[PDB]
XYZ file of C-alpha atoms in Angstrom:
406
model
C -22.340 -100.286 197.867
C -19.630 -102.569 199.257
C -22.207 -104.108 201.593
C -24.211 -105.711 198.793
C -20.900 -106.841 197.313
C -19.730 -108.396 200.592
C -23.060 -110.112 201.246
C -23.133 -111.841 197.856
C -19.405 -112.600 197.929
C -19.838 -114.264 201.324
C -22.914 -116.168 200.144
C -21.198 -117.246 196.925
C -18.147 -118.622 198.729
C -15.741 -116.257 196.977
C -12.990 -116.267 199.604
C -10.570 -113.877 197.897
C -13.303 -111.410 196.923
C -14.428 -111.274 200.563
C -10.869 -110.479 201.638
C -10.614 -107.728 199.022
C -13.990 -106.212 199.912
C -13.219 -106.064 203.639
C -9.762 -104.716 202.804
C -11.498 -101.854 200.983
C -13.398 -100.901 204.135
C -16.593 -102.909 203.611
C -18.784 -103.147 206.714
C -18.273 -106.660 208.076
C -21.615 -106.325 209.880
C -23.623 -105.069 206.904
C -27.219 -106.324 206.825
C -29.640 -107.114 204.004
C -33.381 -106.389 204.009
C -34.199 -109.186 206.478
C -31.181 -108.571 208.717
C -28.859 -111.263 207.366
C -25.147 -110.487 207.627
C -22.287 -111.970 205.580
C -21.590 -114.284 208.521
C -25.183 -115.567 208.446
C -24.881 -116.409 204.757
C -21.424 -117.973 205.089
C -22.639 -120.141 207.980
C -25.738 -121.135 206.011
C -23.750 -122.072 202.911
C -20.935 -123.890 204.720
C -18.147 -121.446 203.859
C -15.855 -122.289 206.785
C -12.910 -120.216 205.569
C -15.118 -117.169 205.045
C -16.792 -117.596 208.450
C -13.329 -117.415 210.020
C -12.242 -114.408 207.940
C -15.426 -112.505 208.807
C -14.968 -113.104 212.542
C -11.284 -112.198 212.283
C -12.441 -108.905 210.770
C -14.818 -108.408 213.697
C -18.158 -109.813 212.540
C -20.881 -109.890 215.196
C -20.938 -113.595 216.066
C -24.440 -113.196 217.543
C -26.084 -110.987 214.914
C -29.860 -111.390 214.626
C -32.045 -111.254 211.534
C -35.643 -109.998 211.640
C -36.803 -113.308 213.104
C -34.008 -113.627 215.663
C -31.910 -116.180 213.786
C -28.218 -116.097 214.668
C -25.360 -117.548 212.600
C -25.283 -120.502 215.012
C -28.968 -121.170 214.285
C -28.253 -121.386 210.556
C -25.163 -123.570 210.980
C -27.117 -125.936 213.228
C -30.018 -126.064 210.776
C -27.681 -126.838 207.870
C -25.506 -129.354 209.727
C -22.189 -127.533 209.372
C -20.330 -128.974 212.364
C -16.986 -127.227 211.897
C -18.751 -123.871 211.568
C -20.790 -124.483 214.739
C -17.520 -125.088 216.590
C -15.868 -121.953 215.180
C -18.886 -119.838 216.129
C -18.936 -121.171 219.699
C -15.174 -120.632 219.946
C -15.757 -117.014 218.898
C -18.428 -116.457 221.547
C -21.641 -117.571 219.854
C -24.569 -117.729 222.273
C -25.293 -121.439 222.601
C -28.764 -120.770 224.061
C -29.862 -117.974 221.721
C -33.571 -118.213 220.871
C -35.315 -116.852 217.776
C -38.752 -115.181 217.878
C -40.539 -118.534 218.276
C -38.211 -119.823 220.987
C -36.157 -122.155 218.802
C -32.601 -122.689 220.042
C -29.753 -124.291 218.042
C -30.217 -127.532 220.004
C -33.816 -127.816 218.759
C -32.520 -127.708 215.194
C -29.545 -130.044 215.650
C -31.780 -132.545 217.439
C -34.634 -132.271 214.937
C -32.407 -132.759 211.883
C -30.357 -135.529 213.468
C -26.952 -133.851 213.668
C -25.435 -136.116 216.318
C -22.018 -134.442 216.542
C -23.541 -130.955 216.573
C -25.829 -132.020 219.439
C -22.729 -133.267 221.288
C -20.901 -129.976 220.740
C -23.916 -127.865 221.710
C -24.537 -129.779 224.942
C -20.867 -129.591 225.944
C -20.924 -125.847 225.230
C -23.768 -125.533 227.742
C -26.931 -125.790 225.642
C -30.051 -126.072 227.802
C -31.327 -129.579 227.048
C -34.914 -128.825 228.126
C -35.240 -125.566 226.201
C -38.910 -125.162 225.276
C -39.932 -123.167 222.205
C -43.093 -121.089 221.741
C -45.055 -124.251 220.914
C -43.930 -126.355 223.868
C -41.514 -128.466 221.830
C -38.253 -129.640 223.396
C -35.147 -131.137 221.720
C -35.807 -134.599 223.188
C -39.366 -134.569 221.830
C -38.213 -133.479 218.367
C -35.526 -136.173 218.331
C -38.010 -138.839 219.432
C -40.656 -137.918 216.855
C -37.916 -137.960 214.207
C -36.676 -141.355 215.384
C -33.219 -140.060 216.280
C -32.662 -142.594 219.064
C -28.930 -142.019 219.595
C -29.489 -138.278 219.921
C -32.464 -138.986 222.185
C -30.217 -141.011 224.490
C -27.767 -138.101 224.619
C -30.523 -135.633 225.510
C -31.852 -138.001 228.187
C -28.390 -138.280 229.751
C -28.010 -134.494 229.754
C -31.495 -134.055 231.214
C -30.948 -136.689 233.897
C -27.274 -135.732 234.280
C -26.548 -139.449 234.411
C -25.118 -142.284 232.333
C -27.543 -143.896 229.895
C -26.916 -147.231 228.218
C -29.113 -149.043 225.737
C -29.031 -151.735 223.084
C -31.524 -153.140 220.595
C -31.033 -156.487 218.860
C -32.880 -158.722 216.418
C -34.495 -161.831 217.882
C -34.055 -164.093 214.850
C -30.446 -163.235 213.991
C -29.077 -161.625 217.147
C -27.850 -158.715 215.028
C -27.213 -155.635 217.145
C -29.370 -152.950 215.526
C -28.740 -150.084 217.939
C -26.280 -149.355 220.744
C -25.097 -146.659 223.156
C -22.714 -147.459 226.028
C -23.917 -151.042 225.579
C -20.668 -152.356 227.084
C -20.682 -150.258 230.281
C -21.872 -151.627 233.627
C -25.202 -150.631 235.186
C -27.056 -151.882 238.272
C -29.498 -154.609 237.206
C -32.078 -153.919 239.902
C -35.192 -156.087 239.487
C -34.378 -156.779 235.823
C -32.246 -159.632 237.202
C -35.483 -161.451 238.050
C -35.916 -162.537 234.429
C -32.535 -164.263 234.693
C -33.529 -165.824 238.016
C -36.678 -167.105 236.305
C -34.564 -168.641 233.555
C -32.370 -170.382 236.114
C -35.468 -171.792 237.828
C -36.932 -172.982 234.533
C -33.603 -174.643 233.742
C -33.767 -176.703 236.938
C -37.360 -177.563 236.037
C -36.268 -178.827 232.613
C -33.667 -180.970 234.379
C -36.304 -182.490 236.660
C -34.638 -180.879 239.669
C -37.541 -178.513 240.277
C -41.303 -178.379 239.739
C -43.588 -175.427 239.031
C -46.047 -176.891 241.529
C -43.584 -177.527 244.366
C -44.715 -175.740 247.523
C -42.362 -173.282 249.226
C -42.937 -172.606 252.918
C -41.433 -169.457 254.423
C -41.735 -167.321 257.555
C -42.700 -163.753 258.430
C -38.991 -163.213 259.098
C -38.230 -163.810 255.409
C -40.411 -160.873 254.353
C -38.602 -157.893 252.828
C -39.789 -154.576 251.407
C -42.010 -155.110 249.493
C -44.016 -158.325 249.751
C -47.384 -157.587 248.085
C -48.175 -161.252 247.359
C -45.925 -163.288 249.662
C -47.046 -161.389 252.775
C -50.534 -162.851 252.284
C -49.551 -166.534 252.223
C -47.395 -166.983 255.327
C -49.488 -169.934 256.550
C -49.987 -172.054 253.423
C -46.928 -170.916 251.466
C -46.693 -170.527 247.689
C -45.695 -172.771 244.789
C -42.597 -172.114 242.657
C -44.925 -171.092 239.835
C -46.732 -168.604 242.068
C -43.466 -167.146 243.364
C -42.122 -166.707 239.835
C -45.271 -164.876 238.719
C -45.187 -162.656 241.813
C -41.499 -161.835 241.355
C -41.742 -160.872 237.675
C -45.256 -159.451 237.362
C -45.748 -157.975 240.849
C -42.097 -157.208 241.663
C -42.479 -159.162 244.900
C -39.012 -158.956 246.446
C -39.514 -161.744 248.991
C -40.650 -164.048 246.190
C -37.432 -163.276 244.314
C -35.336 -164.060 247.395
C -37.168 -167.334 248.039
C -36.513 -168.488 244.469
C -32.871 -167.386 244.748
C -32.410 -169.632 247.789
C -33.445 -172.699 245.784
C -30.523 -172.168 243.376
C -27.928 -171.224 246.002
C -28.396 -167.484 246.369
C -26.717 -164.740 244.279
C -23.703 -167.041 243.833
C -25.983 -169.675 242.336
C -27.442 -167.325 239.741
C -23.996 -165.984 238.852
C -22.750 -169.550 238.357
C -25.755 -170.300 236.142
C -24.889 -167.204 234.117
C -21.153 -167.918 233.875
C -21.941 -171.461 232.743
C -24.133 -170.313 229.823
C -21.516 -167.824 228.601
C -22.298 -164.594 230.462
C -19.017 -163.775 232.213
C -20.136 -160.187 232.861
C -23.524 -160.351 234.582
C -23.161 -160.862 238.330
C -25.569 -160.896 241.255
C -23.944 -160.531 244.668
C -26.767 -159.499 247.000
C -30.427 -160.183 247.753
C -33.467 -157.926 247.581
C -33.520 -155.043 248.419
C -29.795 -154.442 249.085
C -28.915 -155.203 245.458
C -30.442 -151.866 244.405
C -27.994 -149.677 246.331
C -26.262 -148.621 243.103
C -23.093 -147.386 244.797
C -21.035 -145.393 242.260
C -18.360 -147.567 240.611
C -19.590 -150.611 242.549
C -19.609 -153.637 240.242
C -21.869 -155.691 242.522
C -25.258 -156.641 241.077
C -24.444 -155.130 237.677
C -24.721 -156.109 234.031
C -24.064 -154.446 230.694
C -26.867 -153.764 228.196
C -25.306 -156.181 225.690
C -24.661 -158.904 228.287
C -28.233 -158.757 229.584
C -29.635 -158.484 226.057
C -27.596 -161.450 224.820
C -28.363 -163.586 227.870
C -32.046 -162.699 227.674
C -32.168 -163.591 223.980
C -30.526 -166.951 224.685
C -33.170 -167.768 227.298
C -36.107 -166.695 225.117
C -35.114 -168.046 221.683
C -31.886 -169.948 222.331
C -31.415 -173.551 223.445
C -30.971 -172.927 227.177
C -34.628 -173.744 227.867
C -37.212 -176.137 226.451
C -39.913 -174.623 224.210
C -42.339 -174.955 227.125
C -40.044 -173.115 229.537
C -39.117 -170.585 226.853
C -42.802 -169.795 226.431
C -43.419 -169.664 230.179
C -40.629 -167.118 230.588
C -42.109 -164.927 227.855
C -45.603 -165.300 229.338
C -44.512 -164.121 232.792
C -42.908 -161.053 231.222
C -45.933 -160.308 229.022
C -48.176 -160.399 232.092
C -46.026 -157.696 233.697
C -48.250 -155.192 235.526
C -45.744 -152.975 237.358
C -44.168 -151.493 234.230
C -46.852 -149.075 233.048
C -44.880 -145.820 232.714
C -41.923 -146.975 230.554
C -42.064 -148.700 227.134
C -45.693 -149.781 227.574
C -46.761 -146.130 227.869
C -45.476 -145.333 224.355
C -46.218 -148.697 222.730
C -48.601 -148.388 219.754
C -51.850 -150.375 219.606
C -51.536 -154.002 218.514
C -47.889 -154.300 219.542
C -46.509 -157.135 221.661
C -44.395 -156.483 224.740
C -42.917 -158.791 227.357
C -40.765 -156.892 229.827
C -39.347 -156.367 233.298
C -38.469 -153.016 234.851
C -36.201 -152.082 237.731
C -35.664 -149.162 240.078
C -33.025 -148.514 242.715
C -31.132 -145.781 244.527
C -29.237 -142.897 242.915
C -31.714 -142.580 240.043
C -31.126 -146.181 239.021
C -33.741 -147.211 236.477
C -33.956 -149.769 233.705
C -35.994 -152.131 231.583
C -35.516 -155.273 229.529
C -38.088 -156.087 226.874
C -39.004 -158.340 223.990
C -41.351 -156.344 221.776
C -42.562 -155.801 218.229
C -45.553 -154.882 216.044
C -48.389 -157.166 214.917
C -48.615 -158.995 218.243
C -45.232 -160.717 217.980
C -41.868 -159.924 219.588
C -39.114 -159.333 217.010
C -36.441 -157.435 218.946
C -34.977 -157.186 222.428
C -34.424 -153.772 223.973
C -32.482 -153.081 227.150
C -32.169 -149.629 228.709
C -30.316 -148.694 231.900
C -29.488 -145.449 233.662
C -27.973 -144.611 237.050
C -26.646 -141.639 239.008
C -29.429 -139.152 238.282
C -30.987 -137.215 241.166
C -34.179 -136.671 239.168
C -37.661 -137.467 240.463
C -39.211 -140.818 239.537
C -41.633 -139.202 237.081
C -38.798 -137.598 235.115
C -36.845 -140.863 234.952
C -39.898 -142.731 233.667
C -40.645 -140.014 231.123
C -37.044 -139.913 229.896
C -36.909 -143.675 229.324
C -40.363 -143.559 227.735
C -39.178 -140.838 225.346
C -36.166 -142.992 224.483
C -38.485 -145.875 223.624
C -40.675 -143.451 221.691
C -37.623 -142.697 219.545
C -36.861 -146.382 218.982
C -40.449 -147.144 217.990
C -40.309 -144.273 215.501
C -37.034 -145.565 214.054
C -38.361 -149.147 214.010
């Protein structure tokens, strides 16, 4: 009797009628044919006031319908932030799963409710919750092209800071950004900047691609896949550049650094072209230590992205050197598992990845469809204790989101 009245009053957003009905002894936890309660319907319809009145009158905050949907599920599905928060405050199960394994975080992530994802994660939502069909929030967000949400889920999964930025090549317009102004260890991504500094000296006639560099077995550092094979005859600047970028040859990077005056030399080159943030302080491999709150050998996503854009399309380098820099990055062969792994057929990518200690991982890239680069993307993370496979996957999923949003 009063139950039908309360259910439709709650659904209809009739605040005063709900108060009257409950005051006349109506069952606050009455259920319809499918198990929906007044709280379900109020949460679904966005009736914040009524949601609060129902809970004040002792509504079951975690009531299930036939299919296991809770009020929180419905609020998440419908994007009613304030209601989500009230439900959690009143003891809503943040990790409640319906009959097919869907949690509220699946729904918030799928429908792109950024703030609701934030609130759910902070309330203790399991980021890697898998439904009956194997789907996870990160995967839903990525397939939907919700890149910002994807970054949040990656950070929660890795339990680490994640920074990224995406800018237009022609205009320089920042198109996407998360923690783009925070510092992250550069790792081997710095090598693209080193390359630019070398090419600059070449433009000035102070260096030659064909100049031969002789070094000793004592100069070798972990790892020296190319340089360790040419200790007798040495290698040209050109050959060292290719090895550093495309083969991540650390000794090659160090040898090229020496020619510009070490980490101080690169930092001076950077400062002089307008990057007052990016700094290199150490050589390979020590620069990858990624000590927490250590500003040595760090950049910000925007600083790196801006600097990289200036080298590739700006006036810092000649067209010849500009092209050579891009070419070295396109011929990158030690960056399989990140952006290249989720890049659609026919797309262009020129990139450089980096890995270090304390889950440090990152990538800089110029990419785009139709065989031409049209945007720069930079992604960094550090602090995670995750395995290397999980780091790679997480960053790949982040790129999978960006490509979807493209």
